[PDB]
Amino acid sequence: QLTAQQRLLADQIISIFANNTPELQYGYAEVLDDGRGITAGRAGFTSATGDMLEVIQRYSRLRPDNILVPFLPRLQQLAASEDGSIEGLQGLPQRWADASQNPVFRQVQDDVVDELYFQPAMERAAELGAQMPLTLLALYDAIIQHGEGDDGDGLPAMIARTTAKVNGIPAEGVDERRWLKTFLKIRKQVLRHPANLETEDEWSESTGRVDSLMKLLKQGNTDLHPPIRISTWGDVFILPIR
């Protein structure tokens, strides 16, 4: 689906979207007051949503005695109810940062990203018949921020509403640029007006990333060819960085 240069490009763009830097933030760990508890890692794994749990569980099967093991009971409870409480995760941010110095922990983050976000987003693209690299990037960025749940803010509902609006999918002959433009506008509307009010401030301030994908679409860079200029947060980045 994506070239090696296109995937590194996608990762550096989404990294800029989320953290204003093309360097993947494996060691990032923060409370954002968005209802999700602690948000951590290169894809923003989260205490409330179960993806932070999967990372630590998989890592603990590779390395039973790690500094993150004591949080497994609590994370288990938090994931089971989608709870945003950060008790008692005291010390978890620092331990996540330290664990991220181990390439094997970073590798687990890569595997989870691939399993939860990249491969499902590419499977969605294939079902849609989507073939422009820009559409793949837009689906991949959206799956990371919105998730693949069944809520009206999730990627699957956004795709469904895009297809309803334009009367079909690209594999059915709807021009893919039209489908993509509709998807980006629907995505910006969801970020501005989410059904989950706890993420409203967080998501509302993140709409420049949809603007950046729209800018690439309007400039005809649907194939993600270099150089790519991203300046979502004011700072200008030319990608790929070498």
Ligand X SMILES: N[C@@H]1[C@@H](O)[C@H](O[C@@H]2O[C@H](CO)[C@@H](O[C@@H]3O[C@H](CO)[C@@H](O)[C@H](O)[C@H]3N)[C@H](O)[C@H]2N)[C@@H](CO)O[C@H]1O
Can you give the binding site for ligand X, defined by CB under 6 A?
Answer: 44-46, 49, 51, 116, 146-150
Residues 32-91 contacting ligand GCS, CB under 6 A: 32, 34, 36, 39, 43-44
Query: Does residue 145 touch ligand GCS according to CB under 6 A?
Result: yes
Minimum distance between the CB of residue 46 and ligand X, rounded to whole angstroms? 5
Which residue in 56, 140, 148, 155 sits closest to 105, CA to CA? 56
Q: 38 φ, ψ to 5°?
A: -90, 130
Burial label for 7, CB within 10 Å (0-12, 13-18, 19+), is: middle
Q: Hey, how many other C-beta atoms are within 10 angstroms of the C-beta on 129?
A: 16
Q: What values do phi and psi take at 31, rounded to 5?
A: -95, 125
In the complex with ligand X, which residue's Cβ is closer, 133 or 147? Answer: 147
Q: How many CA atoms within 13 Å lie on the side-chain side of 167?
A: 1
Q: How far is the CB of 143 from ligand X (least distance, A)?
A: 7
- x/- mask, ligand GCS, residues 1-40, rule CB under 6 A, reads -----------------x-------------x-x-x--x-
**Partner from ligand GCS, ligand X, none contacting 148, C-beta within 5 to 8 A by type:** ligand X
Contact map string, positions 87 to 126, toward ligand GCS, x by CB under 6 A:
----------------------------------------
Rounded distance between C-alpha atoms, residue 45 and residue 75, angstroms: 12
Contact partners, residue 50, CB within 8 Å, separation at least 6:
79, 82
202 binding partner (options ligand X, ligand GCS, none; Cβ < 5 to 8 Å by kind): ligand GCS
Interacting residues toward ligand GCS by CB under 6 A? 18, 32, 34, 36, 39, 43-44, 144-145, 199, 202
